[PDB]
């Protein structure tokens, strides 16, 4: 399926991923396209961040969906 992705810009992305896959995953395609480290995205869907390890499926993303990522934040 799609998945729409903002960042601290504005920017929609466009990704295609499966319910399957895990928030890993997903950080290689932001690195594959935009070439951002996994640890330097923050996507925080509906108000929850994602873990690493967790699957779409383990969340609640539909077909389509919205997401913002935010670069990490000093603190922790």
């Not at 920017?11 to 480290?37: F, M």
């Amino acid at each position: 399926m799609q998945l729409f992705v903002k960042t601290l810009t504005g920017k929609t992305l466009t990704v295609e991923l499966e319910p399957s896959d895990t928030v890993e995953n997903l950080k290689a395609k932001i690195q594959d396209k935009e070439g951002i480290p996994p640890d330097q995205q923050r996507l925080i869907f509906a108000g929850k961040q994602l873990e690493d390890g967790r699957t779409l499926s383990d969340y609640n993303l539909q077909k389509e969906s919205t997401i913002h990522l935010v670069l990490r934040l000093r603190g922790g």
